[PDB]
Amino acid sequence: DSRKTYTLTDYLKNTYRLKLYSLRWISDHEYLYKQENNILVFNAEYGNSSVFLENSTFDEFGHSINDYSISPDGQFILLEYNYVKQWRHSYTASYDIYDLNKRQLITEERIPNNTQWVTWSPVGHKLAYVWNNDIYVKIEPNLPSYRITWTGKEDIIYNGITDWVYEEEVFSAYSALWWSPNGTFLAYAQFNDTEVPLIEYSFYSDESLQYPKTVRVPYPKAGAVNPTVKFFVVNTDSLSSVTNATSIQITAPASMLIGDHYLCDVTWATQERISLQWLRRIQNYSVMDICDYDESSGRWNCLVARQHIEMSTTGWVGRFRPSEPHFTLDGNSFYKIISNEEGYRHICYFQIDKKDCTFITKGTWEVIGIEALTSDYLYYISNEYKGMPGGRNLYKIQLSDYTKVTCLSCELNPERCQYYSVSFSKEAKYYQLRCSGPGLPLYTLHSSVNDKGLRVLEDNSALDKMLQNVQMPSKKLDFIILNETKFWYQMILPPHFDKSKKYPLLLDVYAGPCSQKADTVFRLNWATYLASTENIIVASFDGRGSGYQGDKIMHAINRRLGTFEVEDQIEAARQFSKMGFVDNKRIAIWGWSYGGYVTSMVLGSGSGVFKCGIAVAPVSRWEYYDSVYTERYMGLPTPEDNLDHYRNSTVMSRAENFKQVEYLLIHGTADDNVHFQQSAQISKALVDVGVDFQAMWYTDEDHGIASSTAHQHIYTHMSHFIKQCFSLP
Amino acid sequence: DSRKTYTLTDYLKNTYRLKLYSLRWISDHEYLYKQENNILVFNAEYGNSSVFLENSTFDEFGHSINDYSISPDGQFILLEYNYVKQWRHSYTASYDIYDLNKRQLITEERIPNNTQWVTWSPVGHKLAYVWNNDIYVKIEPNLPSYRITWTGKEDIIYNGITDWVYEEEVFSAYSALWWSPNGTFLAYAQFNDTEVPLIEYSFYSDESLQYPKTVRVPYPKAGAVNPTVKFFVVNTDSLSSVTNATSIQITAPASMLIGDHYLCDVTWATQERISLQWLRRIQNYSVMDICDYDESSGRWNCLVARQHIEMSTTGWVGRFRPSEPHFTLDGNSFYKIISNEEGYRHICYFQIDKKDCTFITKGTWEVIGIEALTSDYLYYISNEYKGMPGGRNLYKIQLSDYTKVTCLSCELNPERCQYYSVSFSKEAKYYQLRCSGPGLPLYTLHSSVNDKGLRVLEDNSALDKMLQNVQMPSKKLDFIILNETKFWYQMILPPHFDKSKKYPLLLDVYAGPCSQKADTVFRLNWATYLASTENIIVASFDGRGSGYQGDKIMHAINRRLGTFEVEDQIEAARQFSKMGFVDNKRIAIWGWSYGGYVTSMVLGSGSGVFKCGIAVAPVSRWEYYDSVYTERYMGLPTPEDNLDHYRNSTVMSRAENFKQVEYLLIHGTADDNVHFQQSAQISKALVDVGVDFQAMWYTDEDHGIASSTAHQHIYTHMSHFIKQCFSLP
Ligand SMILES: O=C([C@@H]1C[C@H](N2CCC(c3cc(C(F)(F)F)nn3-c3ccccc3)CC2)CN1)N1CCSC1
Ligand SMILES: O=C([C@@H]1C[C@H](N2CCC(c3cc(C(F)(F)F)nn3-c3ccccc3)CC2)CN1)N1CCSC1
Ligand SMILES: *[C@@H]1O[C@H](CO)[C@@H](O[C@@H]2O[C@H](CO)[C@@H](O)[C@H](O)[C@H]2NC(C)=O)[C@H](O)[C@H]1NC(C)=O
Ligand SMILES: *[C@@H]1O[C@H](CO)[C@@H](O[C@@H]2O[C@H](CO)[C@@H](O)[C@H](O)[C@H]2NC(C)=O)[C@H](O)[C@H]1NC(C)=O
Ligand SMILES: *[C@@H]1O[C@H](CO)[C@@H](O[C@@H]2O[C@H](CO)[C@@H](O)[C@H](O)[C@H]2NC(C)=O)[C@H](O)[C@H]1NC(C)=O
Ligand SMILES: *[C@@H]1O[C@H](CO)[C@@H](O[C@@H]2O[C@H](CO)[C@@H](O)[C@H](O)[C@H]2NC(C)=O)[C@H](O)[C@H]1NC(C)=O
Ligand SMILES: *[C@@H]1O[C@H](CO)[C@@H](O[C@@H]2O[C@H](CO)[C@@H](O)[C@H](O)[C@H]2NC(C)=O)[C@H](O)[C@H]1NC(C)=O
Ligand SMILES: *[C@@H]1O[C@H](CO)[C@@H](O)[C@H](O)[C@H]1NC(C)=O
Ligand SMILES: *[C@@H]1O[C@H](CO)[C@@H](O)[C@H](O)[C@H]1NC(C)=O
Ligand SMILES: *[C@@H]1O[C@H](CO)[C@@H](O)[C@H](O)[C@H]1NC(C)=O
Ligand SMILES: *[C@@H]1O[C@H](CO)[C@@H](O)[C@H](O)[C@H]1NC(C)=O
Ligand SMILES: *[C@@H]1O[C@H](CO)[C@@H](O)[C@H](O)[C@H]1NC(C)=O
Ligand SMILES: *[C@@H]1O[C@H](CO)[C@@H](O)[C@H](O)[C@H]1NC(C)=O
């Protein structure tokens, strides 16, 4: 075979790029698509397009624009620039608004610099933005903005934006604003972090900075004082420039107010009905309030009879939080994914006025998400097909007869496509399917009336032809049995794999709760290079604690992080080592983040299975990590709750057992998520017992270690380490 | 040869231990010594002893006693416990006083906990101590203290103790108080750090600490705002007669007050005469005031007729600071080591009111220090003997005839002993000689009346026996000639050194200004292991900028750090190749501190000479280092002064050239001296240009990386690295 292999440089320089087709639906019939930096509008039925915005119109703009956002009526475009990253989702930017009718920039009443968040209303062209932690509303892009809140205070009071923990662990967003469906009301949360302790770490910046600066971030570690939260709704149709806006508060239910709690979901039901879910700090009890606007009062009333309790006896509520309700047109009923009596996640149908919900799906598999809802059909994604928890397909269920379930993606191309996501148009007249494996990604457009496959948007033809000239690895997805339970694994196998030769094996671990590392997704990554060029098998295993297989598996690690999920990785590797094609003298393990924790726990286990391993930004002790995530799984680190297990599940306590392995420990110094602290305590424990190891800090890098140069450097360094570990003397 | 080598474990575990003879003179005739944890008092003349304090007297004390000190009158002992290290010299401790006459502890009016410094008066049993940054005086150990200052303020005002930079760079001590010779007056300095910027860094502490602490220290980096200083004298004899005794200020001379300046020396001359040396921020100009108590005004006056100017046209003043004066009994004249007209440091004799001094020693060699002064003789240490700048001997010069110079130590044991220090009794009636190489340390007692040897105190016989059975390395001390100038080097050579073989060479570097790494000292260290077990030649070289050889050499790097001292190390490696016993494919370089900087500069020079190197806690950019040290050699980092050279001598600017070498970078995270910042910027610059390298951080370790476990871990880590660098594959 004279073809080149998939090398480290190919991964690092992105030589082989997957093609995408990211569209944005603007109506029931049309979508926007960025082609050649021109924004085109497409008609879904025929495939014809027009140029909505020529790539040249902002040639004289002055700044490089980061992103575009067209108002829902197509009259305005928000130009985003001076982008400055904060955390995972948060950033600041400058904004300008361009009038699409006039074909001119608006120069009056501009959105301020250092704006923290901006959003169009869902209909028309109102704006709401947050600046210096306060909310502002613009009825028209050129008009003076109304100031909604006056309490905004850096690191202390947050209006319409989340603090650190709510951004990272609750909403997965900086935004804490929720327009009503037609833009009449703007709902928002206010966070108060007054008593929340600060994480502090050094930032070194450019060489020219003489004194490092100290970054200070309100961050509750497990057991610490949490932010408090309030919820408000303001009518944006009755604002005055003369009087200050009035925000109506909707207070949490009594069952929440008795102790610490969170706001975890906000979902508008109708123009005049809002739902909110609240979660106790002890995350096994949550309640939904359904609140109606009272025209006489001007107030929002949440009737007790419309209250819905969701709890768990085996673990926490929801995969990472209580799930999202999907309301019908009239908002009188709704659909919601919840754990059934057998512990599998399925769609339940609720009346707003009734306590008992009715499950409309069932079986030993799970609904992943509800994707669209019409009066006749609910569309959802599940891993039902072929009983493969790592595959994903689109289904529809007839609302008048639940026996009638149709798979819409299963048979389109079963050899190439077993993992789908979907994007529906405004009223679900059309949908885009995005197949992402096991073959190359495939984007297709369909119409809902008879599920016609209209056309192929992107089939990655170019890439296919290029990859033909490369010795690409294959992927095996299979299972092993442990106490009569299937647990799935995948192996990235070298080209020309020979079952009679012995290969070194790298165990690629994440293994966080609800994690899935064995799936049918096609990926070009570090593992691709390891298999193709270095002839290493890269395996991953989903053991106890993994998701999408029911709560019996998922909740196995409840109150018990660093136990079964760690043990199951060792057990999988033990079993892989007995296969004929695995060199048991050369088994390695690595992981990032949660997987760095598991890797570290595995290496300190004393198992003798692993010769070496690499931990990148690992958690080392659960009390160091954030409250919302940690306590979900661990409860509170007090003697009357779960302290003994917080204390038993540290990497540090296992330091001695590292004496018989090669360990590389890596961490960014500006990691705001898993603090450098965590690795600092590992290294010190190893030093204290006399264990040699390898280390690398990345100056000013965060949890992603994703700056272009650091990303190349880390993978280069880890490759040297693995190759050295696997070299035969 | 079948003897064991000197191994890493021998070094790390202190297998072969140097015996010391640490004595403390308590009078002209007696000294204290610890034998089997007892404290014996010795008669110097006859060698007989009694037990002064039984090793059992503080069994029921209830604390570990860190140290003790007896009042000069023998009446009390100060017991130090709860010792907590601060910087290089500073610490805090608890103190009890034990009455040696009544033979009981004092329980009344105790020195408080967290005391920063305490000292007995030179005579009697007065105490002065510093607590919460203020000075207190007890006339009697059991009576209430008199408060002296009320301005003390944590990190802001320091009374009687130094701030960070004065401690590290100016006084090499924490204390900033000075009792007059009979204890009447207490002089002290007051430091004001109000506007000095803070270095900030994380300290992680024990694993139990949930949030890391931020250590904040006033620390002026180069060109930043310095502390200001004031000087005061209080009459402690007046304390019990007056409510609040006045601290009389002695202001700096006009020539210092025009700009930033330092107090660099305080020395009492008589009971009523104090001398002070001040140094301009531009450290090539210093002024000594000599100040008399004016009995009729209660004031201190410094006559300009007694003011002495010390300046330098070629560099800074002094080796590291203007030298200390030694006053004759009457306080009307004094001796001082200063640079002569040829650039050599020699003893000059001054009358306090005549500006021209008389040199009493001369030659192409240097006086190291003045050790004692009697009415007839001055005793000093120089490197005159055999023109060996790396040797040290004690000399006696007759004050009534300067042609009469006797070397007291030169010929005592010429092959074993070429490096001496000395400890004189109170009125120099006896002296202990401490020989420290090139053979095993040898401690001997001598009487000044006749300069006859009284007895050997410690000869290290035990160790000599053990070392017979070990294949010890040898040391070659010699010179090479560059541009008509002698430049010294030493080599630690493996046992059975054969000039016909090619050996790997490690260049052990420091090379800061006035450094000396080529000397006659006997050391048991990492180099001993590398030569003995690993058959590596370990070399060091004293190039331009090195000390004890005159200002032509020392001042060569003036305003030009990171040039000649770097180039000369490279050139030294080339010359060691010429010698024909060096494997030119296996030349390594390493150093700590200034040596880490030079190592890094050498490795990024592009010379091709060195295969690999290790930098531990390096400086990387002069603007990151402290003002007093950096500015001494580099002046100010401003466009008008020396900014261009500051910017030109960073490690980071040579990042691209590290592609040619193997590099290991090591730094303690809690380094208060050379901030982790310095290594954080090296790593980032290397990541930025795509260079692979090895790294190790040491959690909560400081500049010394001296905790027991970290010390073993770092030398282990470095050993593996050097061996891998040198291995023939
Ligand atoms: O960063 C973290 C945690 C992980 C946590 N995070 C976990 C995964 C989660 C997530 C990731 C994905 C994706 F991979 F599919 F995209 N989907 N989800 C998800 C979110 C809500 C409901 C269902 C699924 C998004 C939030 C956010 N903070 N660490 C935890 C232990 S080590 C570091
Ligand atoms: O830590 C430092 C500096 C070094 C400086 N330090 C330099 C050495 C100096 C010193 C060391 C020694 C000894 F090694 F012999 F004991 N003697 N002296 C000394 C002091 C005053 C006068 C004469 C000699 C004592 C002060 C104190 N801070 N760095 C400078 C460049 S990298 C880090
Ligand atoms: C959006 O929905 C809101 C809420 O129903 C509408 O506001 C109401 O409209 C009704 C019907 O005309 C009026 O009688 C009420 O007085 C309004 N209520 C409030 C609270 O304002 C609003 O008209 C809709 N907006 C758009 C643009 O369609
Ligand atoms: C944010 O929360 C803090 C409580 O952590 C509030 O401050 C308290 O307010 C009450 C009533 O005004 C005072 O009596 C207390 O002294 C405050 N407590 C503390 C610990 O500071 C604060 O008012 C809240 N801010 C907002 C805007 O809601
Ligand atoms: C939510 O989790 C907590 C913690 O596991 C549960 O509280 C425990 O319940 C029983 C008592 O009925 C005992 O096992 C423990 O004493 C309780 N533990 C703690 C820490 O309080 C609680 O029952 C859970 N909620 C639900 C609905 O299951
Ligand atoms: C001892 O005298 C000093 C010097 O006058 C007093 O310190 C002054 O106190 C006043 C009032 O508190 C301050 O405004 C001055 O700035 C202080 N000066 C200095 C130099 O510190 C001190 O308070 C006196 N002590 C007693 C017990 O009276
Ligand atoms: C220590 O020296 C001081 C300062 O000279 C002595 O105090 C002086 O003593 C003489 C008496 O001989 C008096 O005339 C002065 O008034 C004193 N001066 C001051 C400033 O107090 C002191 O007596 C000496 N102490 C001892 C113990 O000898
Ligand atoms: C597509 O074509 C139809 C005519 O057949 C037209 O009405 C429509 O506006 C076109 N859409 C776009 C986006 O160009
Ligand atoms: C943003 O900053 C620039 C540069 O300082 C300034 O000229 C501009 O007016 C600012 N924009 C707004 C909306 O204030
Ligand atoms: C609105 O409220 C803020 C803060 O409470 C106040 O400063 C401002 O003057 C108010 N304006 C009016 C018009 O009431
Ligand atoms: C040493 O011996 C002499 C007697 O010759 C005696 O006076 C002296 O006190 C003794 N000193 C000690 C410390 O034992
Ligand atoms: C310290 O200096 C500041 C000026 O920076 C001054 O305001 C303060 O009074 C000083 N404090 C003293 C000398 O006690
Ligand atoms: C001190 O240093 C500065 C800068 O090198 C210089 O301009 C000045 O003349 C120097 N003083 C002496 C006495 O050489």
Give the helix/strand (H/E) hosting A159. strand A157-159
Q: Ligand 1 centre from A168 Cα, in Å?
A: 9
d(CA B219, CA B168): 11
Mark which residues 700-719 of A lie under 8 Å from B by CB: 700, 709-710, 712-713, 716-717
Paired tokens of A141: 């892009």
- Residues 6 or more apart from A130 whose CB is under 8 A from it? A115, A116, A117, A118, A136, A152, A159, A160, A161, A177
Residues 6+ apart with CB under 8 A from A454: A44, A45, A47, A430, A444, A445, A446, A447
Decide if B671 is catalytic. yes
Contacts of B201 in chain A (CB under 8 A): 202, 212
How far CA B527 is from CA of A162, A462, B472, B643, in Å, comes to 57, 61, 11, 38
Q: Phi, psi at residue B507, to the nearest 5°?
A: -90, 115
- Give the closest residue (by CA) to ligand 6 atom 28: B244
Alpha carbon distance B450, B97 (integer Å): 39
> Pick from B603, B682, B655, B208: which is nearest to A696 by CA?
B682
Q: Flag if A685 and B713 touch (Cβ within 8 Å).
A: no
Among A134, A194, A195, A247, the mutation site with the greatest number of ligand 4 atoms within 8 A of its Cβ is A194
Tokens of A416: 């190439």
B356 included as an active-site residue: no
Q: Please, is A227 exposed, middle or buried when counting C-beta atoms within 10 Å of its C-beta (0-12, 13-18, 19+)?
A: buried
Structure tokens at A220: 């509750």
- The bridge status of strand A377-382 relative to strand A393-398 is antiparallel
Edge-to-edge strand ranges of the sheet holding B49-53? B24-25, B30-35, B38-43, B49-53
The two tokens of residue B729 are 């594959």
Question: From atom 17 of ligand 3, which residue's Cα is the shortest distance away?
Answer: A295
For the annotated catalytic residues of A, the residue numbers are 593, 671, 703
At B564 the three-state DSSP class reads helix
Which ligand is nearest the CA of A313, by number?
Answer: 5
Report the distance separating Cα B485 and Cα B481, nearest Å: 6
Ligand 1 atom showing the smallest separation from residue A674 Cα: 33
Q: Please tell me the distance from the alpha carbon of residue A200 to that of residue B201, in angstroms, as a whole number.
A: 9
The encoded tokens of residue A466 equal: 């290029």
Q: Which residue has the tokens 């993606």?
A: A409
C-alpha pair distances (Å), A159 with each of A185, A311, A521, B14: 16, 29, 39, 62
Q: Rounded CA gap, A294 and B597, in Å?
A: 73
B204 touches chain A (CB under 8 A): yes
The one-letter code for the residue type at B114 is N
Residues of B in contact with A647 (CB under 8 A): none
SS (H, E, C) B655-693: HHHHHHCEEEEEEECCCCCCCHHHHHHHHHHHHHCCCCC
What single-letter amino acid sits at B519?
D
* CB-based contact A257:A251 (threshold 8 Å): yes
Fold for domain A2-471? Methanol Dehydrogenase; Chain A (2.140.10)
The residue assigned the tokens 């696997």 is A726
Q: Which of A255, A281, A282, A633 to mutate for ligand 5's pocket (most ligand atoms within 8 Å of CB)?
A: A282
- Alpha-carbon distance of A126 to A133, in angstroms, equals 19
Backbone angles phi, psi at B545, to 5 degrees: 90, -15
User: For tokens 């004194």, what's the residue?
Assistant: A211
CATH, range B472-729: 3.40.50.1820
| Tokens representing residue A361 in the block | 């799906």
- B204 contacts on A by Cβ (under 8 Å): 677, 680-681, 684
Question: Cβ distance B570 to B607 under 8 Å?
Answer: yes
Contact call for residues A395 and A407 (beta carbons, < 8 A): yes
Residues 6+ away with beta carbon under 8 Å from A336: A323, A324, A325, A326, A347, A348, A350, A357, A370
Q: In the structure encoding, which two tokens stand for residue A430, read together?
A: 């059309």
Q: Quote the ligand 13 centre to B313 CA distance (angstroms).
A: 7
Among A residues 208-227, those touching chain B with beta carbons less than 8 Å apart: 210-214, 221, 223-224
Q: Which of B210, B685, B690 sits opposite A712 (nearest CB)?
A: B690
Distance CA B671, CA B572 (A): 31
For ligand 10, whether the C-beta of A244 sits within 6 Å is yes
CB contact under 8 A, B709 and A694: no
Instruction: Give the closest of B199, B692, B712 to A690, CB-based.
Output: B712
The alpha-carbon gap from A692 to the nearest alpha carbon of chain B, in Å, equals: 7
3-state secondary structure of B489: strand
Q: Which two tokens stand for residue A659?
A: 């004496």
Ligand in nearest proximity to the CA of B43:
11
Closest CA to A281 of A317, A313, A308: A317
- Calculate how far, in angstroms, residue A286's C-alpha sits from the geometric centre of ligand 5: 15
Q: What is the DSSP string of B168-229?
A: IIIISSSB-EEE-TTSSEEEEEEEE-TTPPEEEEEE--STT-SS-EEEEEE--BTTSPPPEE
Q: Which of A597, A476, A598 is nearest to A543 (CA)?
A: A598
Instruction: Check if A659 contacts B (Cβ < 8 Å).
Output: no
Compute how many other C-beta atoms are within 10 angstroms of the C-beta atom of residue A243: 9
Distance from CA of A678 to the nearest CA of B (A): 9
Q: Where are the domains of chain B?
A: 2-471, 472-729
B698 touches chain A (CB under 8 A): yes
* CA distance to A93, B100, B161, B187, per residue, from B247 (Å): 58, 33, 16, 9
Q: Which residues contact B391 (CB under 8 A, 6 or more apart)?
A: B383, B385, B418, B419, B519, B520
**What is the B320 CA–ligand 2 centroid distance (Å)?**
7
Tokens matching residue A557 = 């690690």
Q: For chain B, how are helix, strand and coil distributed in percent, rounded to 5?
A: 20, 40, 45
To test the contact with chain B by mutation, choose from A649, A679, A693, A699 the residue with the greatest count of B C-beta atoms within 10 A, namely A699
Structural resolution in Å: 2.4
Q: Which two tokens stand for residue B221?
A: 């980096």
Q: Which residues of A166-205 are buried (b: 16+ CB within 10 A; e: fewer)?
A: bbbbbbebbbbbbbbbebbbbbbbbbbbeebeebbbbebb
CA angle in degrees (0–180, nearest 5) for A392-A395-A399? 150
Strand partners of residue B458:
B443
Peptide bond just before B197 cis, omega within 30 deg: no
Give the whole-angstrom CA distance, residue B641 versus residue B223: 11
Kindly give the number of the ligand 9 atom that is closest to the alpha carbon of A112.
13
Cβ B386 vs Cβ B364: under 8 Å: no
